[PDB]
Amino acid sequence: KDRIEIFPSRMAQTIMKARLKGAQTGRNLLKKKSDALTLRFRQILKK
Amino acid sequence: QVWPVRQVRPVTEKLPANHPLLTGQRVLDALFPCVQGGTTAIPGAFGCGKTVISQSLSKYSNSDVIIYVGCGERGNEMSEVLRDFPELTMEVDGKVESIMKRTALVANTSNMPVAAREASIYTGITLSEYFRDMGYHVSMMADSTSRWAEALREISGRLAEMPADSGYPAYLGARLASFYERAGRVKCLGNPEREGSVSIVGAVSP
Amino acid sequence: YLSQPRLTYKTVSGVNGPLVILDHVKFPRYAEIVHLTLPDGTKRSGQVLEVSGSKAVVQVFEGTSGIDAKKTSCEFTGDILRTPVSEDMLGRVFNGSGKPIDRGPVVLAEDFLDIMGQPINPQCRIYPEEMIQTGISAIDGMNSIARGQKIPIFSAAGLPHNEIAAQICRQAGLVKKSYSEENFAIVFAAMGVNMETARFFKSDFEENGSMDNVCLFLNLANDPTIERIITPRLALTTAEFLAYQCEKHVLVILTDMSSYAEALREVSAAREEVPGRRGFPGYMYTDLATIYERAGRVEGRNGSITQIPILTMPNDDITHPIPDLTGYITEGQIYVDRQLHNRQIYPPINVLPSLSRLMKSAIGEGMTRKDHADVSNQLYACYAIGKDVQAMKAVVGEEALTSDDLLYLEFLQKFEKNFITQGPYENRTVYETLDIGWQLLRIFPKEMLKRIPQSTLSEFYP
Amino acid sequence: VCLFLNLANDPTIERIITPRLALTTAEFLAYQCEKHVLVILTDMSSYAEALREVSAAREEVPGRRGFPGYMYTDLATIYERAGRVEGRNGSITQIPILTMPNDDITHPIPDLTGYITEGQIYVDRQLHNRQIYPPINVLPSLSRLMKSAIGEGMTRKDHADVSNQLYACYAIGKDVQAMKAVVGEEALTSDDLLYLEFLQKFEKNFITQGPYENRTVYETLDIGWQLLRIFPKEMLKRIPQSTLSEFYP
Amino acid sequence: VCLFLNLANDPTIERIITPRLALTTAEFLAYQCEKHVLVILTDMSSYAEALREVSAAREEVPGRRGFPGYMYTDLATIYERAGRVEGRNGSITQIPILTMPNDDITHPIPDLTGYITEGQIYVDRQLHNRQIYPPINVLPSLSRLMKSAIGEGMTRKDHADVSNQLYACYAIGKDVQAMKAVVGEEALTSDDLLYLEFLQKFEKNFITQGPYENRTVYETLDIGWQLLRIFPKEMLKRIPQSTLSEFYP
Amino acid sequence: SLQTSFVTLDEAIKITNRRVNAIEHVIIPRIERTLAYIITELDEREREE
């Protein structure tokens, strides 16, 4: 399971590169959303 | 004298690393010490001021003789070095001595024949070994080991040799091991008793 | 010189592919040129490739079709390929081999030169100091080109790079400080190109009154490969003559060296050398180095040479050998992004991944202006922040934004509206670009200009 | 002490001959003098590199990563000279030391090492980053001879089952730690806390050891029992009940 | 039926001749007796292997993966023996079976067979793992039926449209299945649940079919219509309006 | 009203943090390993040729 099941080929490489970029961007946006929610969390907890 | 470049000059014996190497910089001197006769590496990507490290080494060091070496440096990038390096200054009893008579430069551009680029490193280590048998403390710096490596790879490809993992031929590890062990502190060979050593630092372009 | 008569042979041992085996040759030379005469009366030319014993093999540029085994003949120049060169070559066009394409006469040989060229003594190289005006806001303000800096451009296939090159050629020039622009010249070289984008060049460069300082070379795709490999060296040698033997500053432009690499693969396959990485000979690195490192200033001369080649990236792969090695032996790069082309922005330059290694010396107070570096750095940083803020808006919504975020978004929008877009003919001066940058900067309030020293802000912001 | 030296500056090709001479000496001492001999080789990676260089010069059929195809026979020849022989009190023990090119274990060198020897010890760079003097990863380090010198009469009755239970508990600990790395902390159960405590005490006491410390096997089993007592009696599914009654208190 | 039997224990060299020995008899029966023929071949991978044996023995320049270059022309030769012909009756229907090296669709043999045969039917390992007696993946499959099965004398008018709609629906269902593997069930809309439910019903009823269970074509189209009725009529975009009014209720 | 909103807020926060950790510590290492394996296999094919 530690290796995604796909035969080696150039287009496997391209597809995996694209998926890597998409996953990285999605992680960044999700971390941002968590940050904004935590900012609101702290702000309403001011008092 | 004439001495083959691929042969190690013999020595009477080898000695442990005892004396510490000094640099004017505080951080490198205090927390990550070097030794007289040690081996160091440092990245060499663009945008970092390793030229300042070169100047700090050349101005201020326990050593007395220095060798800058080159194996292809993108033309103008080492043209800057050739312009600015001879203008540097020292202090010896207040005398400027900006001639840098403690440095010898060996440089190569990209268009020089591959053999020259490959053999520049061995030329440098031969010269440092000679000036170490003189009886001094010597220091060497390499410009970019990766470019030497790809020059070696190209020379191998010219003769149509079996490529190893990631294309570079099998010589790499053994050659680097030999090259780096060529350094160290020793007692020189000769009737007047004396001693010397060879520090070394190298660059890596990941 | 040569005083002995030229020789002729008819011994043809055989043919294999584009090569021709001869025999019984007295002291053949390595790369000496020869001519061929088919029995039917056609003329041809070729270059000696390999030599062994009394045998000598020769490649033919125009192809080996129609060669007769016993009724052909050949002649030996007895010498290496030389070029006629002269300063009056401006206004002309050629086909790589030097044969004129337009209706002009043969070039008078003011001098003969060896096409292979020579290496340059590193001791004489002088650090580039000045900057070349290009008329493009992206290339001049956001980035820069020094007198000697070798800057390639990457661009995937099917994107408008020839247009960028043509506009650069049209609007090239020097900064007017107040031995003027007459010293500047251009050598344009296009290889392996369609018949379209060739008529376009030869017409448009004529339509804008600039042939007085241009020396142009064309080599269509259907031409012999040996013409393709030969041409760029010819261009470089004429550039060297015009720049160093005569005091000129020369801007060389090369297009699509990937086809040059293809021709290199061709000649390698002909010689039957074992391919390596991705079917490319290992020594192609040193070959490209030979085609490079013909730039920079030299002591004892007031001239300069500056190379700006273009490349076709296969499938947006930075780790492909061609762009990777080119980066290893060049001092920066300018990117072109597909999304910007889809956004109908005529200059599609994406200035974020691009970088020029010699900014610090190309500009300054004695140069265009003192505030230039500060303005450039501030513009880059705030654009990065603006892209980040658009990403922020992608989720957080417009109502959750601050005034600062609105400033960043508006600045970004106006920036691609004005700073990037130029038009196919708008020749902007450097001062004009800096003025536009200042106008865009004024949108932000005074305090946010963190990258701007206070004195410059007082001088220019009001 | 018998020493055979080879610095890196010596000719590469001589390294191919270097080990066989030492092995011949070991055989002589073992089977003509009844000397119990231990043998150590610093780096077979250099041997593999030199053999690769020779083969590349000889244009021989390549294999994985352009290595010579016949390392199997060669390495078997080098390592086979070990064990004991009937009617003689000599013996030979081999302890080579291998340097991986990097963290990978599927590189051909260790892969062909795996088939030969009846076990292997593993050293983990991560544990060395934790400043543990013997940074040993137990999990990838089985020994194929845990049968003929273990049990009552050799070391002690309750040895093998203790080893197996410790292996299982450590593996479960690694699994739950991986789960905690993602799910969080509040979602973990009591048994997970017990396993984490077991890991912490096991790494603090068992593997940790002085540069000169020398523990007997008996106290090692005592420490193992002390660690095992943390869990309840019923959770040790890897141990028979009789031993549990015999040694738990 | 006429059989030719070449077994694994026989010498491999005669495999080069065997298929032509079959096809010559086939074409004689198809063009000198006007008898319709269904000719079956199987495991062409062994035929390609025999070609590799011969090529390697003859030291010719290898192409892809040691296979000779002209084996493309060879396969063109061995597959171009079907189709009707005027002035006569009868024909040949060619159905080879192809054993698959690992599971790489992009292996040379399947690729070159893909450039010659008009279509291909695909057998999938996942379906066989999930216990489906005809484990066939519709997605990679394709044939040239666009002009054959229409309805004017063939099955019926709505046939091809129904088939295309089912194919599109299955593709979207697999897309939803991929979507569900990422996020939880909460993000599912009504459309996603509909698509998943359709996927299970289609897999469990349409494709699932025991041996000897002959099904009429009209019955298959009726089953497809039953599957289609699950979705409300608005989302069936491919269907022409007249057919939608006629058959959906 | 303040604390009632706060409840839903912290629940959404914990969910998002859990999702972030899940994306970070699972998918990316698998992708990197797959890419390395693919590069190795293509290198092997080229060497054999």
mmCIF file of C-alpha atoms in Angstrom, chain B residues 45-47 71-80 82-83 107-112 114 117 146-147 150-151 153-154 157-158 160 163 165-168 205-206, chain C residues 118-120 122-123 125-128 148-150 271 273-274 277 282-286 289-290 292-293 295-297 325 327-331 355-358 360:
data_model
loop_
_atom_site.group_PDB
_atom_site.id
_atom_site.type_symbol
_atom_site.label_atom_id
_atom_site.label_comp_id
_atom_site.label_asym_id
_atom_site.label_seq_id
_atom_site.Cartn_x
_atom_site.Cartn_y
_atom_site.Cartn_z
ATOM 1 C CA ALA B 45 23.892 28.256 -4.774
ATOM 2 C CA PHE B 46 23.289 31.782 -6.020
ATOM 3 C CA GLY B 47 22.197 34.519 -3.642
ATOM 4 C CA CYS B 71 36.423 24.011 -12.849
ATOM 5 C CA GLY B 72 34.076 26.212 -14.887
ATOM 6 C CA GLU B 73 32.159 29.139 -13.392
ATOM 7 C CA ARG B 74 29.749 30.609 -15.917
ATOM 8 C CA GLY B 75 32.139 33.186 -17.337
ATOM 9 C CA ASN B 76 31.316 36.599 -15.896
ATOM 10 C CA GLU B 77 30.691 35.093 -12.457
ATOM 11 C CA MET B 78 34.384 34.236 -12.090
ATOM 12 C CA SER B 79 35.363 37.304 -14.091
ATOM 13 C CA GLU B 80 34.099 39.169 -11.032
ATOM 14 C CA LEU B 82 39.413 37.821 -11.205
ATOM 15 C CA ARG B 83 38.545 41.513 -10.965
ATOM 16 C CA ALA B 107 40.541 29.028 -12.947
ATOM 17 C CA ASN B 108 38.627 27.451 -15.811
ATOM 18 C CA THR B 109 35.759 28.662 -17.968
ATOM 19 C CA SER B 110 33.095 26.496 -19.566
ATOM 20 C CA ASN B 111 34.718 26.382 -23.004
ATOM 21 C CA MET B 112 38.113 25.159 -21.837
ATOM 22 C CA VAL B 114 37.301 18.942 -20.655
ATOM 23 C CA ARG B 117 38.584 21.138 -16.142
ATOM 24 C CA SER B 146 29.256 19.212 -9.136
ATOM 25 C CA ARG B 147 30.643 20.824 -12.282
ATOM 26 C CA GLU B 150 29.598 16.431 -14.708
ATOM 27 C CA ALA B 151 32.837 17.127 -16.572
ATOM 28 C CA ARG B 153 30.646 12.269 -16.585
ATOM 29 C CA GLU B 154 30.999 13.856 -20.019
ATOM 30 C CA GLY B 157 30.461 9.416 -22.026
ATOM 31 C CA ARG B 158 32.996 10.251 -24.718
ATOM 32 C CA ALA B 160 31.141 5.098 -24.184
ATOM 33 C CA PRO B 163 26.790 4.456 -16.702
ATOM 34 C CA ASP B 165 23.126 4.849 -10.939
ATOM 35 C CA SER B 166 21.821 8.285 -11.943
ATOM 36 C CA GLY B 167 24.174 8.281 -14.930
ATOM 37 C CA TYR B 168 27.406 9.246 -13.214
ATOM 38 C CA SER B 205 25.782 22.865 -6.016
ATOM 39 C CA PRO B 206 22.641 20.855 -5.207
ATOM 40 C CA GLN C 118 38.461 30.538 -30.652
ATOM 41 C CA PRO C 119 38.245 30.553 -26.855
ATOM 42 C CA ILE C 120 38.556 33.823 -24.954
ATOM 43 C CA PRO C 122 39.540 34.804 -19.038
ATOM 44 C CA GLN C 123 41.995 37.481 -17.886
ATOM 45 C CA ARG C 125 36.937 39.607 -19.412
ATOM 46 C CA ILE C 126 35.467 42.764 -17.880
ATOM 47 C CA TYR C 127 32.442 42.749 -15.607
ATOM 48 C CA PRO C 128 29.363 44.108 -17.453
ATOM 49 C CA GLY C 148 27.462 41.127 -21.619
ATOM 50 C CA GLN C 149 24.817 39.205 -19.712
ATOM 51 C CA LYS C 150 23.673 35.990 -21.406
ATOM 52 C CA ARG C 271 28.959 8.981 -37.080
ATOM 53 C CA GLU C 273 28.257 7.208 -31.647
ATOM 54 C CA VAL C 274 26.288 5.577 -28.847
ATOM 55 C CA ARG C 277 20.611 10.611 -21.879
ATOM 56 C CA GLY C 282 27.205 13.496 -23.683
ATOM 57 C CA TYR C 283 29.501 16.095 -25.245
ATOM 58 C CA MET C 284 26.537 18.264 -26.242
ATOM 59 C CA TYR C 285 27.185 20.156 -23.005
ATOM 60 C CA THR C 286 30.618 21.255 -24.189
ATOM 61 C CA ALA C 289 29.361 25.863 -24.166
ATOM 62 C CA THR C 290 31.182 26.497 -27.439
ATOM 63 C CA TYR C 292 27.988 30.179 -25.588
ATOM 64 C CA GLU C 293 30.740 32.179 -23.877
ATOM 65 C CA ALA C 295 29.890 37.514 -24.700
ATOM 66 C CA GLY C 296 31.077 40.090 -22.179
ATOM 67 C CA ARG C 297 33.361 43.073 -22.603
ATOM 68 C CA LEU C 325 22.315 22.608 -18.899
ATOM 69 C CA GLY C 327 20.682 27.222 -16.896
ATOM 70 C CA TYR C 328 23.953 25.734 -15.685
ATOM 71 C CA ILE C 329 25.755 27.965 -18.208
ATOM 72 C CA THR C 330 23.580 31.092 -18.197
ATOM 73 C CA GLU C 331 22.993 33.914 -15.729
ATOM 74 C CA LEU C 355 15.541 36.183 -12.223
ATOM 75 C CA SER C 356 18.535 38.163 -13.488
ATOM 76 C CA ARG C 357 21.815 37.659 -11.657
ATOM 77 C CA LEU C 358 23.416 41.010 -12.611
ATOM 78 C CA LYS C 360 22.911 45.218 -9.009
#
